């Protein structure tokens, strides 16, 4: 049956290291227009540290790897995204726990629990112009894919492609949370940096699950 292995999750996180390095300046520029120009650096610094610690733990259980990842990000990313992405991974790990692979259904639950964590820490609602504008649609994609008994790889391919449109959907919102909310209507016309990071993370998961 269709599942996502522990080494695919390792591979995912490893690809995040690559993407956050490559798109560092792009994310920075997004956070320059409607922020303080640091997001890219924060994500790069965080996943860079994650990906360094990863080879020493590549053989532990999925819950272990995700929880350490969240804790690593927390100790390193800083700013608003550090506690938010840290919480995502920590809550995702307690959905998972000692798994060695994950069914679509468990992936959905994992992402559902992660996002619920970012929503209660940050209180963002749809249209606030945050990473939650990508998480929520992503979770609902996973839910739908699960109903339809899709394979894990095409489920993530569809979640990823939904993440893309959701990130883009932010351009148009006036920010109501985060630093961008201080700019008022000046935040309209600009893509949310954190939502872009979620998009990149989902794009790398689709890649990780292809085989």
């Amino acid at each position: 049956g269709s599942s996502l292995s522990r080494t695919q999750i390792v591979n995912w996180l490893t690809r995040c290291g690559d993407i956050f390095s490559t798109e560092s300046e792009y994310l920075t520029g997004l956070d320059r227009e409607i922020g303080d120009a640091d997001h890219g650096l924060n994500m790069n610094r965080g996943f860079s540290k994650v990906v360094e610690k990863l080879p020493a733990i590549a053989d532990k259980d999925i819950g272990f790897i995700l929880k350490n990842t969240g804790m690593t990000l927390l100790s390193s990313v800083g700013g608003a995204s550090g506690p938010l992405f840290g919480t995502f991974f920590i809550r995702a790990a307690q959905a998972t726990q000692a798994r060695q692979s994950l069914t679509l259904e468990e992936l959905y639950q994992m992402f559902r629990d992660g996002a619920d964590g970012v929503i209660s820490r940050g209180k963002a609602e749809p249209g606030d112009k945050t990473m939650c504008d990508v998480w929520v649609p992503v979770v609902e994609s996973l839910r739908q894919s699960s109903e339809q008994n899709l394979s894990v790889p095409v489920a993530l391919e569809a979640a990823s492609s939904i993440a893309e449109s959701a990130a883009q959907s932010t351009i148009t919102m006036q920010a109501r949370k985060g630093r961008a909310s201080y700019l008022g209507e000046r935040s309209i016309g600009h893509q949310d940096p954190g939502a872009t990071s979620v998009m990149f993370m989902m794009q790398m998961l689709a890649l990780a699950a292809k085989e």
């Binding site: 920075t28 320059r32 409607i34 922020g35 303080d36 120009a37 640091d38 650096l41 924060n42 610094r45 927390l74 100790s75 390193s76 990313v77 800083g78 700013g79 608003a80 995204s81 550090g82 506690p83 938010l84 820490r121 940050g122 006036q174 920010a175 109501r176 949370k177 985060g178 630093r179 909310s181 201080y182 700019l183 008022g184 000046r186």
Partner: protein
């Protein structure tokens, strides 16, 4: 580009080392980075801690000393520090009487300082919190993250630092900070953007007849871009906004160490009014000439007199910055004789020093 730096990765390492070298009274800790009074822990006193991104020097490390902070957590440039750094620093400075965290209101500072407060509680450390949200530019908290903590953080760290030194309890410290937070008012403008070391371009560009009005401290654009005409004009718009945006309602969370949980507290601010007495801080955001700050003060005193406000003390200088930003902020904090007594009390920090 053009900064006095070496490799971008090493800027804070080099700058913090220079801080520790210059200051016998300060200890630079490593792995995790943070800074403390070389004589912390000080037994018998509430310990005062704060922190935030690098780039606002002297806030906060310039305020570590007797009468002020016991330690501070510098983060990365314009980046809130992480909970482990705040946790270790608070552990290091704990004087048996509790630890007070002063937190500027940014999503990141709030969340990281909150995670840290809970870790401390769970370690048996008595702890509570004061949130600073003095920046009146963001008029309305309804559909925003809330007002920013800017230069008034300095006035509150001094006053609360004086009470902590006087021997006041955690609770009396916290309540003092929260009261002052409720009647302190700030606003900033930029004539030119800062450039972060990793950037080679400024955070925003601006024509010679334009200003960023209602700026904070991390280099984001302000609440609007408007014409720049004169000192008097600029100071008049700022002051008039201190008054019209003076009314403010919002919810701030503080740690109840007895419950062991976050306590929402809905609180409202009044605009400053005829008959109030204030401390005025005219604050360089980084690259304004001291002479121009005196020109700003000249105008501010006139507007204060006209509005019925009596300035009892002032600070004029570079106290809460944004790297190399050309601009300044005005802060007016309402006071009484008891608060003035704490103002005049000794303080011995790199940036502030008098008495004793």
């Amino acid at each position: 580009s053009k900064k006095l730096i070496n490799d971008v990765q090493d800027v804070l390492d080099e700058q913090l080392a220079g801080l520790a070298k210059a200051h016998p009274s300060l200890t630079l800790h490593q792995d995790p980075v943070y800074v403390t009074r070389a004589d912390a822990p000080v037994a018998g006193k509430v310990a005062l801690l704060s922190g935030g991104g690098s780039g606002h020097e002297p806030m906060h490390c310039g305020y570590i000393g007797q009468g002020m902070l016991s330690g501070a957590c510098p983060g990365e440039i314009f980046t809130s520090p992480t909970p482990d750094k705040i946790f270790e620093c608070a552990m290091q400075v704990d004087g048996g009487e509790g630890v007070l965290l002063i937190i500027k209101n940014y999503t990141g500072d709030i969340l990281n300082f909150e995670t840290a407060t809970e870790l401390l509680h769970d370690s048996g450390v008595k702890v509570t919190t004061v949130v600073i949200d003095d920046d009146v530019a963001v008029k309305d908290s309804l559909y925003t993250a809330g007002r920013r903590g800017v230069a008034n953080t300095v006035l509150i760290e001094k006053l609360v630092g004086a009470a902590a030194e006087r021997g006041d309890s955690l609770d009396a410290c916290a309540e003092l900070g929260r009261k002052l937070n409720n009647q302190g008012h700030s606003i900033g403008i930029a004539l030119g953007a800062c450039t972060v070391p990793a950037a080679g371009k400024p955070s925003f560009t601006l024509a010679d007849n334009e200003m960023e009005f209602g700026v904070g401290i991390h280099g984001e654009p302000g609440i609007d871009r408007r014409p720049f005409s004169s000192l008097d004009q600029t100071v008049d718009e700022m002051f008039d906004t201190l008054l019209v945006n003076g009314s403010y309602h919002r919810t701030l969370r503080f740690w109840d160490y007895q419950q062991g949980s976050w306590q929402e507290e809905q609180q409202t601010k009044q605009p400053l009014q005829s008959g109030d007495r204030v401390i005025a801080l005219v604050n360089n955001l980084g690259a304004t000439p001291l002479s121009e700050l005196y020109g700003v003060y000249n105008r501010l005193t006139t507007r204060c007199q006209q509005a019925g406000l009596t300035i009892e003390r002032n600070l004029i200088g570079a106290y809460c910055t944004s790297l190399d930003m050309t601009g300044f902020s005005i802060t007016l904090l309402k006071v009484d004789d008891e608060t003035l007594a704490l103002w005049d009390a000794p303080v011995h920090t790199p940036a502030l020093n008098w008495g004793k």
